[PDB]
Amino acid sequence: KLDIKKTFSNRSDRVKGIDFHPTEPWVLTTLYSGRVEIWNYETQVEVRSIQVTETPVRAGKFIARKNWIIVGSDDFRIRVFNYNTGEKVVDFEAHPDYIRSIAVHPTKPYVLSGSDDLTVKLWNWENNWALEQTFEGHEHFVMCVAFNPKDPSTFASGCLDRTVKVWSLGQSTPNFTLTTGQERGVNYVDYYPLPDKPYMITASDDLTIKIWDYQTKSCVATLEGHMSNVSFAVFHPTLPIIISGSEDGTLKIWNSSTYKVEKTLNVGLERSWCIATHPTGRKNYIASGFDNGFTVLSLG
């Protein structure tokens, strides 16, 4: 089964955000230099690239049903571009501080942004990008936001305050706050996508990855072996693996039942910052962004 092949890797300035298009063979990268790139990874030619700002662009996602990309940067701004025409759809100050993470609701016209200003904000693109809600409660930088794909009326925020908070749209306090015991904070949070386990996963500067049952709040497992900050850890949408990446320069693939490491990849691009998985498992593609560029891998 596991048969990793290097589909396309290119050098660039540090890749902070990365995302797959669901129906075109494209990957978006958002760089520390303010540039973003959309690559066709099958032909190895750029679809479109934009010098968005001079500040780091830490977050970026496709919104394929609108033909957009949405990005967020340290100059405080969210910007949306039509990837077919290059048109800048909107450009607004979202937070008075860095933007760490953006999530897009799977069906509704909502975007979440998580920020160093201690908040998550919800924006509605059918209401002229209005701020519809600010979720307050975290006490340090909000590093990651993610909808629960099985119930996207709720979402998780991971924060340097050592907690994950799970919230309901339209309600002002968390449904619960998860004390992770990851004392250097939480850099990333992700949901297992399938209905048989109510699992979430967190990654930390404390070198650990933890699996949580979000119904009981118990820690199911702690995955150890990275040697520097763990930037992300995710469940794959079709394969029984977890994929993590670290400032130690490695990606790690772990068995999602036994929680034992299956493969460590020394990609050769220095520190790893971000991850994406092809949302339908096409060619088992994954992509990760690093200090010195990105790589698109086929797992099988």
Partner: peptide, 7 residues
Amino acid sequence: IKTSHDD
């Protein structure tokens, strides 16, 4: 001032 996680 950015207290941490500037990279």
